[PDB]
Design an enzyme around this catalytic site. Sequence first.
Site, PDB file in Angstrom:
ATOM      1  N   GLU G  41     -21.135  17.066  -2.576  1.00  0.00           N
ATOM      2  CA  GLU G  41     -21.627  16.103  -3.079  1.00  0.00           C
ATOM      3  C   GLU G  41     -21.436  14.920  -2.230  1.00  0.00           C
ATOM      4  O   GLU G  41     -22.351  14.318  -1.741  1.00  0.00           O
ATOM      5  CB  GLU G  41     -21.449  15.594  -4.469  1.00  0.00           C
ATOM      6  CG  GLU G  41     -21.636  16.544  -5.629  1.00  0.00           C
ATOM      7  CD  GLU G  41     -21.290  15.666  -7.080  1.00  0.00           C
ATOM      8  OE1 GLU G  41     -20.399  16.347  -7.577  1.00  0.00           O
ATOM      9  OE2 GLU G  41     -22.044  14.709  -7.390  1.00  0.00           O
ATOM     10  N   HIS G  51     -27.801   4.925   6.591  1.00  0.00           N
ATOM     11  CA  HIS G  51     -28.454   3.639   7.188  1.00  0.00           C
ATOM     12  C   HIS G  51     -28.381   2.440   5.887  1.00  0.00           C
ATOM     13  O   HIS G  51     -29.145   1.388   6.243  1.00  0.00           O
ATOM     14  CB  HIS G  51     -30.057   3.779   7.659  1.00  0.00           C
ATOM     15  CG  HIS G  51     -30.011   4.752   8.745  1.00  0.00           C
ATOM     16  ND1 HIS G  51     -29.412   4.283   9.977  1.00  0.00           N
ATOM     17  CD2 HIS G  51     -30.087   6.106   8.859  1.00  0.00           C
ATOM     18  CE1 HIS G  51     -29.538   5.633  10.741  1.00  0.00           C
ATOM     19  NE2 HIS G  51     -30.208   6.443  10.025  1.00  0.00           N
ATOM     20  N   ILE G  88      -7.176   1.954   0.352  1.00  0.00           N
ATOM     21  CA  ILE G  88      -6.636   3.091  -0.588  1.00  0.00           C
ATOM     22  C   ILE G  88      -5.861   3.661   0.622  1.00  0.00           C
ATOM     23  O   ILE G  88      -6.201   4.049   1.985  1.00  0.00           O
ATOM     24  CB  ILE G  88      -7.691   4.445  -0.840  1.00  0.00           C
ATOM     25  CG1 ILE G  88      -8.599   3.794  -1.874  1.00  0.00           C
ATOM     26  CG2 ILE G  88      -6.794   5.402  -1.594  1.00  0.00           C
ATOM     27  CD1 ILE G  88      -9.684   4.802  -2.312  1.00  0.00           C
ATOM     28  N   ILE G  89      -4.372   3.727   0.518  1.00  0.00           N
ATOM     29  CA  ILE G  89      -3.596   4.477   1.424  1.00  0.00           C
ATOM     30  C   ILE G  89      -3.228   5.458   0.914  1.00  0.00           C
ATOM     31  O   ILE G  89      -2.844   6.011  -0.417  1.00  0.00           O
ATOM     32  CB  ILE G  89      -2.468   3.435   1.280  1.00  0.00           C
ATOM     33  CG1 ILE G  89      -2.956   2.135   1.928  1.00  0.00           C
ATOM     34  CG2 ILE G  89      -1.319   4.102   2.287  1.00  0.00           C
ATOM     35  CD1 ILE G  89      -1.715   1.138   1.983  1.00  0.00           C
ATOM     36  N   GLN G  94       2.128   5.283   1.716  1.00  0.00           N
ATOM     37  CA  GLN G  94       2.246   4.238   0.823  1.00  0.00           C
ATOM     38  C   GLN G  94       3.810   3.843   0.809  1.00  0.00           C
ATOM     39  O   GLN G  94       4.803   4.889   0.818  1.00  0.00           O
ATOM     40  CB  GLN G  94       2.116   4.618  -0.712  1.00  0.00           C
ATOM     41  CG  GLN G  94       0.610   4.762  -0.978  1.00  0.00           C
ATOM     42  CD  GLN G  94       0.250   5.080  -2.253  1.00  0.00           C
ATOM     43  OE1 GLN G  94      -0.820   5.867  -2.452  1.00  0.00           O
ATOM     44  NE2 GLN G  94       1.116   4.866  -3.171  1.00  0.00           N
ATOM     45  N   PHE G  98       2.128  -1.152   4.964  1.00  0.00           N
ATOM     46  CA  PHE G  98       0.890  -1.052   5.523  1.00  0.00           C
ATOM     47  C   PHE G  98      -0.055  -1.904   5.044  1.00  0.00           C
ATOM     48  O   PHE G  98      -0.852  -2.552   5.644  1.00  0.00           O
ATOM     49  CB  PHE G  98       0.593   0.261   5.933  1.00  0.00           C
ATOM     50  CG  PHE G  98       0.920   1.165   6.960  1.00  0.00           C
ATOM     51  CD1 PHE G  98       1.758   0.691   7.872  1.00  0.00           C
ATOM     52  CD2 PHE G  98       1.185   2.545   6.685  1.00  0.00           C
ATOM     53  CE1 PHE G  98       2.474   1.456   8.809  1.00  0.00           C
ATOM     54  CE2 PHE G  98       1.807   3.386   7.405  1.00  0.00           C
ATOM     55  CZ  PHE G  98       2.481   2.843   8.728  1.00  0.00           C
ATOM     56  N   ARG G 100      -0.623  -4.961   3.577  1.00  0.00           N
ATOM     57  CA  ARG G 100      -0.774  -6.591   4.001  1.00  0.00           C
ATOM     58  C   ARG G 100      -1.515  -6.269   5.172  1.00  0.00           C
ATOM     59  O   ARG G 100      -2.448  -7.276   5.363  1.00  0.00           O
ATOM     60  CB  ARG G 100       0.434  -7.121   4.242  1.00  0.00           C
ATOM     61  CG  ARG G 100       0.997  -7.639   2.693  1.00  0.00           C
ATOM     62  CD  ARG G 100       2.318  -8.261   2.994  1.00  0.00           C
ATOM     63  NE  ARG G 100       2.885  -8.894   1.822  1.00  0.00           N
ATOM     64  CZ  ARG G 100       3.369  -8.217   0.767  1.00  0.00           C
ATOM     65  NH1 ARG G 100       3.785  -7.012   0.848  1.00  0.00           N
ATOM     66  NH2 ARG G 100       3.624  -9.178  -0.194  1.00  0.00           N
ATOM     67  N   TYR G 134      -1.783  -9.186  -4.149  1.00  0.00           N
ATOM     68  CA  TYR G 134      -3.196  -9.911  -3.619  1.00  0.00           C
ATOM     69  C   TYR G 134      -2.980 -11.382  -3.533  1.00  0.00           C
ATOM     70  O   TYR G 134      -3.464 -11.891  -2.735  1.00  0.00           O
ATOM     71  CB  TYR G 134      -4.023  -9.172  -4.349  1.00  0.00           C
ATOM     72  CG  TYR G 134      -4.383  -7.738  -3.923  1.00  0.00           C
ATOM     73  CD1 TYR G 134      -5.056  -7.436  -2.773  1.00  0.00           C
ATOM     74  CD2 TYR G 134      -4.357  -6.764  -4.910  1.00  0.00           C
ATOM     75  CE1 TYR G 134      -5.323  -6.347  -2.131  1.00  0.00           C
ATOM     76  CE2 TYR G 134      -4.733  -5.578  -4.419  1.00  0.00           C
ATOM     77  CZ  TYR G 134      -5.266  -5.000  -3.163  1.00  0.00           C
ATOM     78  OH  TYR G 134      -5.771  -3.999  -2.833  1.00  0.00           O
TER      79      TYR G 134
END
EC number: 2.3.1.57
Lengths: 170, 169, 169, 169, 170, 173, 173, 170, 169, 169, 170, 169
Positions: G41, G51, G88-89, G94, G98, G100, G134
């Site tokens: 899917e 596009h 998403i790491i 994790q 990485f 930041r 964040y």
Amino acid sequence: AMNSQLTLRALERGDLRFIHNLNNMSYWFEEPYESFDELEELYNKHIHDNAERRFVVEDAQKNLIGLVELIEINYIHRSAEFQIIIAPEHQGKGFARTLINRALDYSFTILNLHKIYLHVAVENPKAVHLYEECGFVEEGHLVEEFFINGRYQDVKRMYILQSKYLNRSE
Amino acid sequence: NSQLTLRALERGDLRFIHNLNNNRNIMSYWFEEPYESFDELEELYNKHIHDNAERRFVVEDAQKNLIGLVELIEINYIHRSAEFQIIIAPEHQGKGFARTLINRALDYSFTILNLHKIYLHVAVENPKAVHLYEECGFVEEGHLVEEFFINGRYQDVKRMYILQSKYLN
Amino acid sequence: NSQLTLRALERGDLRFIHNLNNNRNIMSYWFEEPYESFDELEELYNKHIHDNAERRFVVEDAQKNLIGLVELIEINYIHRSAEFQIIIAPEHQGKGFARTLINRALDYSFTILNLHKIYLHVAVENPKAVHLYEECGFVEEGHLVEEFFINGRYQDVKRMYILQSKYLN
Amino acid sequence: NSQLTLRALERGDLRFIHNLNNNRNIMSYWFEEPYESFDELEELYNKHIHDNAERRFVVEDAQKNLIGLVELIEINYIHRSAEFQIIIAPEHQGKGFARTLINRALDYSFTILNLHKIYLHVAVENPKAVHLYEECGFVEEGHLVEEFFINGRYQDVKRMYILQSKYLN
Amino acid sequence: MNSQLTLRALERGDLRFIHNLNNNRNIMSYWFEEPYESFDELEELYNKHIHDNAERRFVVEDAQKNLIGLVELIEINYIHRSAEFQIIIAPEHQGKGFARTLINRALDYSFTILNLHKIYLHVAVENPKAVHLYEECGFVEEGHLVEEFFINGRYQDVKRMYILQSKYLN
Amino acid sequence: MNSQLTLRALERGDLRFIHNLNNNRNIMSYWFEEPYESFDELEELYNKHIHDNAERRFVVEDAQKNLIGLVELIEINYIHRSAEFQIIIAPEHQGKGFARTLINRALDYSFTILNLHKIYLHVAVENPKAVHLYEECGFVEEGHLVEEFFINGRYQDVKRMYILQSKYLNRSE
Amino acid sequence: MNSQLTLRALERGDLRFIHNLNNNRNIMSYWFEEPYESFDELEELYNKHIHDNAERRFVVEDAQKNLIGLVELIEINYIHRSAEFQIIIAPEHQGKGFARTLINRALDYSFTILNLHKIYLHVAVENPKAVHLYEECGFVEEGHLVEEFFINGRYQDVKRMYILQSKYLNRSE
Amino acid sequence: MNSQLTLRALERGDLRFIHNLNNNRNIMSYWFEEPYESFDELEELYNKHIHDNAERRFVVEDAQKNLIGLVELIEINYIHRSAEFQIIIAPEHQGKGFARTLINRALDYSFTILNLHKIYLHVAVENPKAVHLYEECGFVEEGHLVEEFFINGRYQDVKRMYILQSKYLN
Amino acid sequence: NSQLTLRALERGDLRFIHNLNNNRNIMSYWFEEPYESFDELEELYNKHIHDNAERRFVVEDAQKNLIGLVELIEINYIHRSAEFQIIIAPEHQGKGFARTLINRALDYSFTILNLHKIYLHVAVENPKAVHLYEECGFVEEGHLVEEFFINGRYQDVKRMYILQSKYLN
Amino acid sequence: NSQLTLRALERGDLRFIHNLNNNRNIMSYWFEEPYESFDELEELYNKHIHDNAERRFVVEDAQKNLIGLVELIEINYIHRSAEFQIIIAPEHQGKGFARTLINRALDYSFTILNLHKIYLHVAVENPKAVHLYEECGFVEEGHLVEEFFINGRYQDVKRMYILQSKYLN
Amino acid sequence: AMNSQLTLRALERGDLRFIHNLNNMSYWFEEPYESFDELEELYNKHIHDNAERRFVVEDAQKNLIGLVELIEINYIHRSAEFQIIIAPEHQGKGFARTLINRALDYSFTILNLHKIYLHVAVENPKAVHLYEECGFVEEGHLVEEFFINGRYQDVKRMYILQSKYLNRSE
Amino acid sequence: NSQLTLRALERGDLRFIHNLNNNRNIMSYWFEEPYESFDELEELYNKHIHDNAERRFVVEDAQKNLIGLVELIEINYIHRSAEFQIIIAPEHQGKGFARTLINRALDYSFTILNLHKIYLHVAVENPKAVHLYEECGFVEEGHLVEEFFINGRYQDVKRMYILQSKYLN
Ligand SMILES: [Mn+2]
Ligand SMILES: [Mn+2]
Ligand SMILES: [Mn+2]
Ligand SMILES: [Mn+2]
Ligand SMILES: [Mn+2]
Ligand SMILES: [Mn+2]
């Protein structure tokens, strides 16, 4: 004598090269073609069309010997035109009569056609005689029908009926 | 016989079906359309994959040799009937597989598809086949006159049937 | 009777066909596909316009009233056979048209299509119809057991045929 | 006769062609495909609009009444030949238009299309038609045995031709 | 054994396995309510309904990636928030105690990811051991469908059993 | 009165009526298991499923051609030979006694034309009058589905009721 | 280490990796607002939206070409000039610091290449460590969305956090 | 006046009205998140998304069938069970007290038919009267989006306000 | 320089084009449509294969190393003008190739395509590039204010042109 | 020269055609559509496979080395004329193949296609080519002024023809 | 004198009848046609093709006067062939020079072509002289180029350049 | 002026656009493709309905008379720029509507589309138009040399721009 090993099989895509090699103007379902590429597209287009049926002839070793074609097939009148083409390297080996018998047998015991006809150059009386031996009879002498080798030539039209081919021996 | 299996026909089996048609040497049909060329057979196959009016099964042994074909055609799901044809490859004919295949077909027809009636056609000139069908429970319901043009002449065929109620007892 | 004509079915006739199917009140088919709505019939008609397995004709009188329908189905051009069905509109039943229509259908089948055999099915519980077909030259070739589910129960039907050789002599 | 004109066939003429086919009452063809209903004819028309193998002309008078049809089929542009058929509407048959139409067609075929040969088929059982064609300059080149199934029997037809050299001298 | 069972979304490469499961089970199988028999039909039904959310399927694998079974959610309705659940365990893995674990994985998915409200299933009345197993996993009978399915030559009754999100989560 | 009710296969021109029936009922309606709200969605779902045999519908008319109601068979399975039935009568024709007649027409069609084996339906537990009507027409409860449908702000239970071909056809024999 | 992280536009060959990331996280994933579960899917949704400019994605690689993670911009609107961002790491990467760096790469792209005006994101209220991360990168809470997402069996609240182009670009000027 | 307001599913014939509402309002309008300007574009976006369930729309009519306004549910997610709601009242019908009634009709539909869990909306921070009206109908502020929309020449803040199914139903 | 060649771009060159776009690190376009992924580039390439509004050429050396790209865009065949962009791969910058490539591009534009005018855009903050273009015969016709958002701020660019008449004399 | 053969062009020859176009280094056409990349040529090839207006032959030696190309374009089958171009591969130029190829082409054109006239264009600035064509029997019928933009300037070309009557006598 | 009221307009579908009436063998984008039905399909096929451009000529009363065609347009060489056709009933009224001027003006001030050429029968010296008066010059005398009225005839090829037509008066 | 309105262009306005193009008598473009025939315009319109690179508005008065057209083309949503063209129908020229239309366009561009810059081209030989644009706040950023072939010769045009920051104060 050793014509026993000739087989007929329905034409398929892989046979198109061979058909292209055989023709030296040809048509596919009455549409003209010259390039192998055009033949390929015409082949895809007419795969489900019943107006023409073709069979390639092979030997025990799978060499491509020739071609048997029924065209102008009409299933109300129950008739068809027959053409046979033997590859140059296999001409003169006596295979023709066998192929003609296979074609008539197919036409008359499987397709259930009523009549089969063909055209043969008047200037090829050996071929005319061969067809007469296989049971065909002249029904026409077409005047200046085909432009071949720089001039219009006459051709015989010859036919055979299902009743004759099937009950010949009774 | 115990190790014969049915499996639903798939594209990879078409060469085998094509070979069965060449040896048998009469006009073959796919969803009532006649075919000769492998290419025509393949296109008819792709076109009718979702059509339920015919169902086919290949017969294999424990070693996966291709033994034959079982076909149900003219399937009608209101009247709940179908025509059955069975074809055993030449090299496997005469080994006693026929009764087994007939039973597999009836079992499928009557315990999976839930059909009510199955019929078939068998040449009048093949009384051995007619007798075999009678032994498997079929009964003559018709003698069709000059129904099929086969081998250069119109031939008569018996039409034989069996009902789900009979088979399921 | 002399003034009855057959003409090839056209899109504009589908309303009439649909009306015939409603009063007859049994499951109807178009190229072996069942239909109920006029819309389904119209789409099946567009889809099978070039399909030669079935041919239909509307029956009209001198005044262009729609009398009935003649259908040839299961047409096979190798075996040269077809199944025939005839439907007369309720208001025109009992006027003596049936024999005439049967003759027109056979004539078409045998002098235009060049078929070899025509068969039909007729309910065993309609012996008057069976007798009418026998008078027109048909002969019973089978008595099909519980072939069709009609009116809540499986019914037997006669299968009757006639050959081109017989009709033409 | 002087006021008869030929005009290339268009979609709007299909009704007329269909009417001509009903009166003749044998199976008609459009580019070698048979048709019966107007709907089938219309579809075959759309399909072959770009096909060179057949060409048709409707015949009209000064007042635009539809008189008949001139058809060239099996046209081959290398061998430069074609088969010719003429159909006159029932109400205009027997009025002396035929010879005029034949002359118009030959003139077109030989002075505009630059064909080399024109041939036609005429029933052996219609010797008056054969005689008319002989008067117009055609000569028998074949007697085709049991070529066409017409009205319940296979019939012979004469094949008649005329060459451009003959017509132009 | 059971902690290492995983669910993963069914993909095209798994269809051979699904086809094998259908052959062994030997009853008519369905894909988006359409019956299938041939692998080809299964593959085309799979391609056609890839974006259809009325059914979702998962294959069950162990740590070594052996194919254990299949979990299916069907008749999914996102307004009433319900679905039918079916579980099929490959023959060789039946009887090993995987079932309860798979059922819990299916309910967990249904109730903590899809946010469904209700899950129901069908189980043959003639398999009371299965019925009892479902009762142990929290399902309750809500219906006894009479002659609902033609299976193995006869119309059979099935229990319809359900469980609600509130019950499974609390 | 009821003798003069006719069934006819649903056609495109009837879709306005179907749409009107859906607006009055005021719960989510489905066409081939797809929910629809606009007339345009209904029309496109109709075009899409014309040749789909999993559902069949019939409009009910009187002698004067007034549109009375709708009969639907859904979830039709031709192997198990079963289907779900729903009947909807237009508001202005409710309470005239037509329901039993329509139910008989539907059963007759299902069992003498489609040759189905079983017909079932759903009826709200909170509509015991409807449940009783179905029991009188020969249906029997086979399940009491708990919180099956979200209707009018809450999950409601429904009875599932069935009847078999053998019973409807041969009851009298 | 972090200097050697690169972004590159997502390609068809990366979809296996994206699929693997979705399996480990074990919550419902979306592609152009359509949920997906199977690789097949995901692949068809990828072909369909090639596009479509409403979403843009980038895979993160190290010097050795190991696949580190994914940067996604969704709900991109080029009139209001805003987009939602998700990062998403991969599990194995994790806790290596990485995040930041990837956030800076994403902001830089959004604000110096796409010329967007605002970037926002959602972070679970129950992940205050992420919220704090964040805030350090310059995002500010603009909403606390109540029971916005059904995750792990219950509706959870999420913070919505934003940053503007003017702040990210000109903070130093 | 208010008891006689009805909601009905938007249909193709209503698009002229929707287009007129967009011209008067004079901000960029969207259909399935795609901006439209021309009636032609609106009509093609309408045809393309007829079967798309991520947005649902209703026109508001009175007893006489005058077109009053439009109710839209967008960003519908059927797992989280939430949607964004927008209401647009035709200029000539603004100020007549229809709004609260329409809002209640929309929530009723959302919560008693679609079975959604949450409905949220956006309202300009510079329209505190609208914000207060929504608070009265049971909505609560959950966010104050900073410079979220470029409207009338400048980026503007909007309140995001929500209501839950449990609250509206109890 | 003598050994630099231009050849029409082909599908197999798209990887190279994609690599050039990654290191350049600004939004790239294909027929005015922006692209980022190789897959998007490939689809835009298939879609515009027969579109004459843009033409591209890869630059190779005698050893077939890929040096750079020459693009003509906004080609208008009535006004006979086009915009030109040139990109040299990082590892080949600073080897003196630029003037040669510019000459090849102008030569193509003016001796094969028969264009009348070629223009380009060059950052105002790259006066070395501006000077190089002036040496090759281009003249400033505009100083576009805040035309492009590049590196976080709107930048001015020079627009420079040259005419066929000038280049050919 | 005796061992040179002509063979109808096929898809596999496109590489060769593309190579011939690169060396000539002016804009090439396939059925009057310009192309530069192999990809464009391949698409134009697929598009015009059924188009009669141009015909091509590749020239090979006994060992199958690719020598050159013979092209007939603007073929009109009513007026029976065509334009002829010949292209010899660089490595085979100056070896005396030209006259032989020209003779083969005329022979084909006049004894197989049955054309009436063959014409060609030759740059006025290539008088050696013009002289070669005059020796092969062509005669100037026009001096086309500024007909083609080639290498930066509009150039005149001679139009030269030969008729079937002349070549065959 | 009263040629002032002639107008050119781009050909459109409704003009096809007129084009069909004008031809007594024609081509559309070098593809031959005879029936109006074929012309219709060829028209739909080439609507976006720039190799040929056509204009119908009308008077103040909208009578269809004639046709102006540019074919073989090549935008690198910047050349085209021009043909003009006046309907029989409008021939001999002096419109030709006006139409030729309109065509050249279009070609040279709008399309920006460099050269325009045409063909005229050698046996129509009046037409040849007319073209010379409009500024065309003979560049070829094509021998037996066209089969017309039963024999091959010669034609003049005549051209004019943009520089000449635009600066003639300077 | 107060009663002039903009509305998004729709299919029913195309006849008007076609009329504007005939009177103006220069080559017109739709999404950079030139058009002449109404049929070509209609097909280009259907093809680009979903393309955002150009946006158009018709100008109407209170009585619905069609006054003119406002077009934004070369819209780029990253750089946030667009080219603007305005056309007033001949019969409405000279009535003072131009400034109003320019203001409507800028307002739309800068308060709805959120563009950063708008530019336009105006003939050097139309200093009155240049002055009008300067009064509405535009400034010359380029003098494009021989940019457009108009009325038989290459003409120079001014390129004028205005920024959103300036207009929004
Ligand atoms: Mn023929
Ligand atoms: Mn059948
Ligand atoms: Mn279902
Ligand atoms: Mn969204
Ligand atoms: Mn040409
Ligand atoms: Mn552009």
